Amino acid sequence: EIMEKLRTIVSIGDPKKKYTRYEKIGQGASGTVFTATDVALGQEVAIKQINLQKQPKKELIINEILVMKELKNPNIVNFLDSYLVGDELFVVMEYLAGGSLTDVVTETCMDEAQIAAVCRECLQALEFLHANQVIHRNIKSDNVLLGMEGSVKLTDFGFCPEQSKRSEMVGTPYWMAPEVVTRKAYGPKVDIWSLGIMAIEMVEGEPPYLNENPLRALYLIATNGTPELQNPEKLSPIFRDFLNRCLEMDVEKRGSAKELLQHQFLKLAKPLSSLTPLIAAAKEAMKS
Numbered sequence: 001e002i003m004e005k006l007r008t009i010v011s012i013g014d015p016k017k018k019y020t021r022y023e024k025i026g027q028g029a030s031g032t033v034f035t036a037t038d039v040a041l042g043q044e045v046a047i048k049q050i051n052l053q054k055q056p057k058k059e060l061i062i063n064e065i066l067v068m069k070e071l072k073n074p075n076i077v078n079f080l081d082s083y084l085v086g087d088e089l090f091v092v093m094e095y096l097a098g099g100s101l102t103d104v105v106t107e108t109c110m111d112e113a114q115i116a117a118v119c120r121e122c123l124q125a126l127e128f129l130h131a132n133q134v135i136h137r138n139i140k141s142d143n144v145l146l147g148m149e150g151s152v153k154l155t156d157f158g159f160c161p162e163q164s165k166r167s168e169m170v171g172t173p174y175w176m177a178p179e180v181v182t183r184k185a186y187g188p189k190v191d192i193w194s195l196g197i198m199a200i201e202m203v204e205g206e207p208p209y210l211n212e213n214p215l216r217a218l219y220l221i222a223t224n225g226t227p228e229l230q231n232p233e234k235l236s237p238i239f240r241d242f243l244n245r246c247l248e249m250d251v252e253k254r255g256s257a258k259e260l261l262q263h264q265f266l267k268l269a270k271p272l273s274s275l276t277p278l279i280a281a282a283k284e285a286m287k288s
């Protein structure tokens with residue numbers, strides 16, 4: 001087969017002439033991710049190189065790249081373009097110079113206004129994914145990019161994780177909502193849950209359940225959910241309220257993305273340029 005319908009996403013041309021100074025940045029289960037420079041625009045991009053030959057049956061399934069093509073939003077890392085050489089698909093996406101939310105969380109302390117900005121930006125992205133029936137599933141520190149000009153973007157989701165029951169857990173899935181860990185049918189609002197968790201992490205410098213064995217963490221998530229703050233009184237009442245609405249254990253009561261964009265806590269937001277000192281400090285701390 002000719003893999004039809006590649007026509008819909010591939011542009012003509014050699015991606016090794018359109019882009020230069022490739023540098024490897026991420027191996028990965030089916031994907032090398034490079035960084036590189038557009039020879040015409042100067043712009044830096046991420047390029048995922050995919051061997052369709054080793055793409056087990058996942059052929060039209062992996063033209064959910066076409067879904068990436070249709071669904072574009074300021075608060076996600078967007079598809080830019082794609083090229084083909086032989087059976088190597090190069091997918092070109094936005095590159096954001098900055099750091100991950102994790103790095104900033106580990107090396108700086110954030111105030112409530114800056115946390116309010118991040119959450120605002122994350123909720124805009126969520127609202128978008130949700131209106132288009134995408135659940136992200138992995139809303140963690142590690143999948144938020146903070147841009148040196150104040151951009152916030154979500155990263156590392158599909159749709160268009162499942163571990164055999166017979167397997168040990170090694171990692172703790174600290175971000176996962178209750179209804180997820182007990183393997184019930186779930187919806188969008190799990191992303192809200194996880195955002196909740198992520199907000200705690202921005203305050204505490206760390207995720208919940210890091211002192212915890214994975215199976216205990218699972219249990220606590222199912223029975224208690226709302227991880228329960230080291231020192232509540234440290235947080236403004238409005239922020240705790242925000243947390244509460246995100247971390248409501250009954251799905252129906254927990255807030256939607258759209259609801260929560262109207263919550264009073266996002267009115268604290270500082271402008272996004274307030275995130276840029278956070279990044280510079282994180283870069284400085286990591287020169288080790």
Ligand SMILES: N[C@H]1CC[C@@H](CNc2nccc(Nc3ncc(C(F)(F)F)s3)n2)CC1
Pocket residue numbers: 033046077093094095096097098099100142143144145155156
């Ligand atoms: N899934 C997480 C997000 C990617 C991250 C890679 N490191 C990094 N560090 C500084 C800036 C930056 N910007 C990016 N823009 C686009 C990008 C790609 F599309 F590759 F994800 S990474 N990325 C580590 C784990």
